[PDB]
Amino acid sequence: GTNAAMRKAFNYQDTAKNGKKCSGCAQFVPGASPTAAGGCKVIPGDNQIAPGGYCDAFIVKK
Amino acid sequence: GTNAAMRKAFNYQDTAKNGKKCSGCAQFVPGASPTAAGGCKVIPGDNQIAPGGYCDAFIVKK
Ligand code: SF4
Ligand code: SF4
């Protein structure tokens, strides 16, 4: 399932934005494997977050 | 929202069981902060899973 509202609020996209992507973001909750879709701490109920996606809420992880 | 049917299936509770709680479970999908409600792989369509809750499907995260 996806959280359409939130994805739209953050202008989520399935592709990276100039090297910026979910897999390198502090909010990402990775799936069972690298290429698996995961979750996001700020997009509740969404389990279709692509590791190579991106949104306005991105924050480089440490 | 919550998924009352799935919560009932796994005997979800809002408190921990012998120290076991959602925030320490491998099926948990954390919310924005460690204390915010999150999601769970075993209770689809529920975004009100308490980090201090528990269910029979608990599995320690390693
Ligand atoms: S905040 Fe945006 S960039 Fe970061 S993991 Fe969630 S969807 Fe991806
Ligand atoms: S499986 Fe049960 S204990 Fe684990 S996160 Fe889901 S509700 Fe909580």
- In CATH, what number is assigned to the domain containing residue B24? 4.10.490.10
Distance of CA A61 to CAs A21, A31, A58, Å?
Answer: 10, 17, 9
Chain B residue nearest residue A39, CA to CA: B29
Tokens 């190579």 belong to which residue?
A52
What's the total number of domains in chain A? Answer: 1
Question: Is B60 exposed, middle or buried (CB count within 10 Å of its CB: 0-12, 13-18, 19+)?
Answer: exposed
* B55 phi/psi in degrees, rounded to 5: -150, 160
Closest ligand to C-alpha of residue A24 is 1
Residues B18, B9: Cα–Cα separation, whole Å: 20
Q: State which residues form the domain around B10.
A: 1-62
A30: number of CA atoms within 13 Å, CB side?
A: 10
Experimental method reported for this structure: X-ray
Task: Closest CB to A39: pick one of B39, B44, B46.
Answer: B39
- H/E segment holding residue B38: none
Are the CB atoms for A57 and A42 separated by under 8 Å?
yes
For the CA of A41, the closest atom of ligand 1 is 6
Ligand 1 atom 4 nearest Cα? A58
Residues A21, A23: Cα–Cα separation, whole Å: 6
Give the resolution to one decimal, in Å. 1.5
- Residues in chain B with CB shorter than 8 Å from the CB of A39 are 29, 39
Tokens of A41: 């701490």
Question: Of how many residues is chain B composed?
Answer: 62
